[PDB]
Amino acid sequence: VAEVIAVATMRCLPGLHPIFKFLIPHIRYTMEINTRARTQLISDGGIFDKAVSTGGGGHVQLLRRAAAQLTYCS
Amino acid sequence: VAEVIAVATMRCLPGLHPIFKFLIPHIRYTMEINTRARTQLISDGGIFDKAVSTGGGGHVQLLRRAAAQLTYCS
């Protein structure tokens, strides 16, 4: 969710915008740690696939079901 | 090739058959060693995928190409 907040803040809020200046400390390092998770942790054959029971593709299917339950109220 | 020989020898050559008695020492442990290979070594996410450059699916295509080149004379 924060990466979605991070990318959209960069893409659509310029440096003069007050909402950008509000949110730019709160999106620090979010894109890299999500990239590092997608590269090392939750990748196919990553660290999640060596210990967690939802690894090996089941966590992706769990992420799809969770995204359907990802409501704004939650 | 040894696994194919082993399985065909077990399926088609009974214990009475001389060619079975001839080939049974030469097919010992082949099925288990290949099963362990297909479980731990050449499987998706296996040791091959963790170190070797053809791992992760390329080795299967390479195996298909080699099987096309797997001639009797070779």
Q: Which residue of B has its CA nearest to A49?
A: B45
Interface check for A46 against chain B (CB to CB < 8 A): the answer is: no
Which stretch of DSSP H or E encloses residue A3? helix A2-12
Distance CA B74, CA B69 (A): 8
**Header resolution in angstroms:** 2.0
Separation between Cα atoms, residue B74 and residue B72, nearest integer Å: 5
What distance in Å separates the CA atoms of residue B53 and residue B57, rounded to the nearest whole number?
A: 10
The DSSP symbol for A46 reads: S
User: Running DSSP on this structure, what letter comes out for residue A27?
Assistant: T
B58 touches chain A (CB under 8 A): no
SS3 label, residue B71:
coil
